[PDB]
């Protein structure tokens, strides 16, 4: 067996290295230290970490959102500390229960939620700049920043843009562990079953597809760690037996194959599209489609099944039904 693919048998210790940025080198704060147990399944050195303006900004806005949320949650168990720790998951910070339209809601009915919502956004923006800048400082392409951008956009979509598109803040995602979860059902229910939204189908496809792809990629690279498959950059500029063998595994199995670079593109594409497909799905919901199941029905896509228990008329529609 190759135990190296399971864990690092003999860890190497050596001097801390620093690749110099086009700026910010003096913002790397902290002394590297080394975990021996971490060393067994990853690199042993934790820290240093770059500080920097964008990052500090992100930290500051993010922490303000958290204070707004935690403070409203704390109010909900009436500032009882033990009931706070007990009911945490159930605690939430909500949007307009009431229809204010796009009216700025009172602090008590969604005011605080738009606040936290706003600061969280600035937090995501600041962080994005950090993620984009660090690449440029280090002389790298910006592929990560752009994959991140799609993810943030998706949040914006369920957070702001959809609620704005239909004209109601009431539709936004609450903050809280069970609350943001309950929203998923409320939103699905209101819009006629998200299983029947084509773009939810695409998203899941790409999501499952990432599981498929990272299992197959990760496993492919462990399978050729013996030949230095893990050194992907140099297998790109100078193809070696690692990626030849990896490529042939996949050719002999499925009939076609990637290269060691292009598979990271398929990977990147599939990740990106989870969020991109999701965003379209949301932009279409409310704006142009009210009932996704009914929409499918309209277009002929829906399965239908026999009654098993007898078919039940709507009592409401009975002649001489109450209301």
């Amino acid at each position: 067996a190759d135990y190296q693919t399971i864990y690092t048998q003999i860890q190497a210790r050596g001097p801390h290295i620093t690749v110099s940025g086009e700026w910010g080198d003096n913002d790397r704060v902290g002394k590297p230290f080394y975990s021996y147990w971490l060393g067994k399944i990853g690199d042993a050195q934790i820290g240093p970490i770059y500080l920097g303006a964008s990052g500090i900004a992100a930290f500051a806005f993010g922490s303000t959102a958290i204070l707004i949320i935690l403070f409203n949650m704390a109010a909900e168990v009436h500032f009882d500390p033990l009931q706070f720790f007990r009911q945490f998951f159930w605690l939430g910070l909500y949007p307009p229960k009431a229809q204010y339209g796009m009216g700025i809601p009172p602090l008590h009915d969604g005011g605080w939620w738009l606040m936290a919502g706003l600061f969280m956004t600035l937090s995501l923006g600041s962080w994005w700049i950090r993620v984009y800048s660090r690449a440029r400082a280090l002389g790298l392409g910006t592929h990560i920043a752009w994959n991140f951008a799609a993810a943030i956009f998706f949040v914006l979509c369920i957070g702001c843009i959809h609620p704005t598109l239909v004209g109601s803040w009431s539709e936004g995602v609450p903050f809280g562990i069970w609350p943001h979860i309950d929203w998923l059902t409320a939103f699905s229910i209101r819009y006629g079953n998200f299983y029947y939204c084509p773009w939810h189908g695409f998203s899941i496809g790409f999501a499952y597809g990432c599981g498929l792809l990272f299992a197959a990629h990760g496993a492919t690279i462990l399978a050729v760690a013996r030949f230095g498959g893990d050194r992907e950059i140099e297998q790109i500029t100078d193809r070696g037996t690692a990626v030849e063998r990896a490529a042939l595994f996949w050719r002999w199995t499925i009939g076609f194959n990637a290269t060691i670079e292009s598979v990271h593109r398929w990977g990147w594409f599939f990740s990106l599209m989870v969020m991109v497909s999701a965003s379209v799905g949301i932009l279409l919901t409310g704006t142009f489609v009210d009932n996704w199941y009914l929409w499918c029905v309209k277009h002929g896509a829906a399965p239908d099944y026999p009654a098993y228990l007898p078919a039940t008329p709507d009592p409401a529609s009975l002649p001489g039904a109450p209301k």
Partner: protein, 258 residues
């Protein structure tokens, strides 16, 4: 009236579904599938007595060449014609195109099958600052074994056939990633060292156990040109040698397990 309705029965989301599909196949076929062809193309085959055409499909499926400008100097352009020129000791076992090749000599040394290497650069891999990357700890003196792990220097290496085959002399570290990649051993009864990639080693407290090959076959492990340096292509020869053991170390190994 409805938000979204375009016409007779056409609505927005319905058009977007078609657009979505289109975008996905464009990117997949016209882009991703061509990026998949920067290595190993054009496909090779036998040939014909008379043939004087570019073969359109071989132009169509390829991407435009891209050029990497390499960190310490040079360029690589892909796709390019990397032909396999070097001769192979294999014989076709049947007449039909799909049939496997058989080695005609010793596949371990002839480097065929599992024992093949890529025609990698005869260049020493380099750290970011320009030094040699994979070097023995005799050379990488600022590196050490983490406290708690076995120091394998001194231990015997025990081949698949149970026989002690040498003594670990050194570990080669990757000073770009801080990670051991080979053991160096004094081959028993030869006046030589062998490297062996750490994935082929079972590191015990009292012995390193190497299952790929029998004690005899360490003899013909690929040789390095320098002693404190290893090229990208040498790494491939050394590694491939033991990978070849897994199929070829003994006669049984190429045949069905069950």
């Amino acid at each position: 009236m409805y938000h979204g309705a375009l016409a007779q029965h056409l609505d927005i989301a319905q058009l977007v579904w078609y657009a979505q599909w289109l975008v996905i196949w464009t990117v997949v076929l016209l882009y991703l599938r061509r990026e998949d062809r920067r290595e190993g193309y054009p496909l090779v085959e036998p040939l014909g007595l008379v043939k004087l055409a570019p073969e359109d499909g071989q132009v169509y499926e390829l991407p435009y060449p891209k050029t990497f400008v390499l960190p310490h100097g040079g360029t690589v352009t892909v796709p390019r014609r990397r032909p396999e020129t070097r001769e192979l000791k294999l014989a076709q076992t049947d007449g039909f195109e799909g049939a496997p090749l058989q080695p005609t000599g010793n596949p371990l040394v002839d480097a065929v099958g599992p024992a093949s290497y890529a025609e990698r650069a005869e260049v020493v891999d380099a750290t970011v600052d320009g030094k040699a990357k994979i070097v023995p700890l005799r050379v990488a003196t600022d590196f050490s074994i983490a406290e708690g792990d076995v120091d394998p220097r001194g231990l015997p290496v025990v081949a698949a056939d149970g026989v002690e085959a040498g003594t670990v002399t050194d570990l080669w570290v990757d000073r770009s990633e801080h990670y051991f990649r080979y053991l160096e051993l004094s081959v028993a009864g030869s006046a030589r060292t062998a490297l062996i990639p750490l994935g082929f080693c079972d590191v015990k407290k009292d012995k390193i156990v190497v299952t790929s090959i029998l004690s005899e076959q360490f003899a013909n492990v690929p040789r390095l040109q320098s002693r404190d340096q290893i090229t990208l292509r040498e790494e491939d020869k050394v590694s491939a040698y033991y990978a070849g053991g897994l199929l070829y170390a003994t006669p049984e190994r190429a045949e069905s397990l069950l």
